[PDB]
Amino acid sequence: GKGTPSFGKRHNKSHTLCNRCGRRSFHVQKKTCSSCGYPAAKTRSYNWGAKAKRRHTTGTGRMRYLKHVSRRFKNGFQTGS
Template identity: 75%
Template sequence: YSKRHTKSHTLCRRCGNRAFHRQHKTCAQCGYPSAKLRSYEWGQKAKRRKTTGTGRMRHLKDVSRRFKNGFRENTVARKRTKTTTEA
């Protein structure tokens, strides 16, 4: 039935999807080898799938906690003495 038996897209080394066009030498998913990631305003759902928060956020999880404390560094917490409740 089918005439074609070759693959036009292969794995992309940046996003890992099978969207790298072998002849065009560009990824249909992320736009590799372009420096910036491929995203368009007409693809709101696609942007939602790829945006910050869909991955591990190894660094950003830490930043929010440090922001809450005012990005303090090189300080040691004060010793807390036990308070005795005398009634």
């Protein structure tokens, strides 16, 4: 009974939500996220996972400060009014 009766015993999560990415990939016993690598300082990325890099790279979010850097450069980082 490795199929249907064994699927009834599944009610204990191995992963919960992660703090940096909100992914539900944070392993409870390992205390590590399997997608972004929290709590390591570097973010988990691999050159074989180029599509995953495309999924989580810069520009897939809000860019709350980086949207204005090109415009401030074009104006020359001016000050005043």
